[PDB]
Design a protein around this ligand. Structure first.
Ligand SMILES: [Cl-]
Ligand SMILES: [Cl-]
Ligand SMILES: [Mg+2]
Ligand SMILES: [Mg+2]
Ligand SMILES: [Mg+2]
Ligand code: NA
Ligand code: NA
Length: 326
DNA sequence: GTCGG
DNA sequence: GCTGATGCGCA
DNA sequence: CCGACGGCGCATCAGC
């Protein structure tokens, strides 16, 4: 990988600011730099060169200078050698333990995995499930399994009502060889911006996936978003597949393109597209693209008939999902 | 941390 | 209950 | 040279 050194460096630092320093802005700042640099088609040979790129500033350039000179960064070596920092960072890897909780747990001497398993009682349900499948959630999902999981989900959706449409989004939709989790966008005719008089559209689908033992646990669940756990069925005498995170998001059918755009990501792409829409005087969310009022407030949703249409409004060359990755 | 008001 | 803030998610 | 930075769903707690 071309500038992997640098981008691993910046990505490790971002994680440090988010998880340990709880500096969310520095987090984004490192993330922005890392994306632009990873996109940069020449091997970077100095800090000054990188500083031309948007979102690289003086300090990231010093850091690139150091790393190019020595193959490491001292700041990161300090961080790597601080048990406290390192235990904080590590707890955030549990699903449902973010920066606050991680920090609190460490402040009362919960520093290891063994410690968490001995204090289940201190964990809410989400954290308790995060911990239970901690090792499973660390693994990636090969595309060939994602294809099995998709087949399973679309099959059951169809079974509940053939008018549902389910679309596997995220990295999968971008053509990744492996995904972190499974992201499913859901639409039904009876759910539109103009209204829902029909009850339990998401519920019916979650219930049916539990009925067939695909969904095994629920992290959080509302009327439009489900966050939970699933598992492919294994064969006799072969060890089980790991459990996997699954997110299902019910979007109004008439807002499908904004939704699919949102759920396809990547998260950096989304944030840069939304940032760009603003420079052009629009605001994009998963539901709509709207123009900006001078008073700050957003006006009315513009009509969209394709993903392509959203890019057009902000005057971007359409980018296929595979080119929305990092 | 960066870029821009 | 509510509104709002915060925490932890998602892309 | 301080001070915004995409946007939002769900869970939970504070102060009504
Ligand atoms: Cl749309
Ligand atoms: Cl909206
Ligand atoms: Mg992700
Ligand atoms: Mg995903
Ligand atoms: Mg996901
Ligand atoms: Na720059
Ligand atoms: Na976490």
């Amino acid at each position: 990988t071309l500038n992997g050194g640098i981008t691993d460096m910046l990505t490790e630092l971002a994680n440090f600011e988010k998880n340990v320093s709880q500096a969310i802005h520095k987090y984004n700042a490192y993330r922005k730099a890392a994306s632009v640099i990873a996109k940069y088609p020449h091997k970077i040979k100095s800090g000054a060169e990188a500083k031309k790129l948007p979102g690289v500033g003086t300090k990231i350039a010093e850091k690139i200078d150091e790393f190019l000179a020595t193959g490491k960064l001292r700041k990161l070596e300090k961080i790597r050698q601080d048990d406290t920092s390192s235990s904080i960072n590590f707890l955030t890897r549990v699903s449902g333990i973010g920066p606050s909780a991680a920090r609190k747990f460490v402040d009362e001497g919960i520093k290891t995995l063994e410690d968490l398993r001995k204090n289940e009682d201190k964990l809410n349900h989400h954290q308790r499930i995060g911990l239970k499948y901690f090792g499973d959630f660390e693994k990636r999902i090969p595309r060939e399994e994602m294809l099995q999981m998709q087949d399973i989900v679309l099959n059951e959706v169809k079974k509940v009502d053939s008018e549902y449409i389910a679309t596997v989004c995220g990295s999968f939709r971008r053509g990744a060889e492996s995904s972190g989790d499974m992201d499913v966008l859901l639409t039904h005719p009876s759910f539109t911006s103009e209204s829902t008089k029909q009850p339990k559209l998401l519920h019916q689908v979650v219930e049916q996936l539990q009925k067939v033992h695909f969904i095994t646990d629920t992290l959080s669940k509302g009327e439009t978003k489900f966050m939970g756990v699933c598992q492919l069925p294994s064969k006799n005498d072969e060890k089980e597949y790991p459990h996997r995170r699954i997110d299902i998001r019910l979007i109004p059918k008439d807002q499908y393109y904004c939704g699919v755009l949102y759920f396809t990501g990547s998260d950096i792409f989304n944030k840069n597209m939304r940032a760009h829409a603003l420079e052009k005087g629009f605001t994009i969310n998963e539901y709509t693209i709207r123009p900006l009022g001078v008073t700050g407030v957003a006006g009315e949703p513009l009509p969209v008939d394709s993903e392509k249409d959203i890019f057009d409004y902000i005057q971007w060359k359409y980018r296929e999902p595979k080119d929305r990755s990092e």
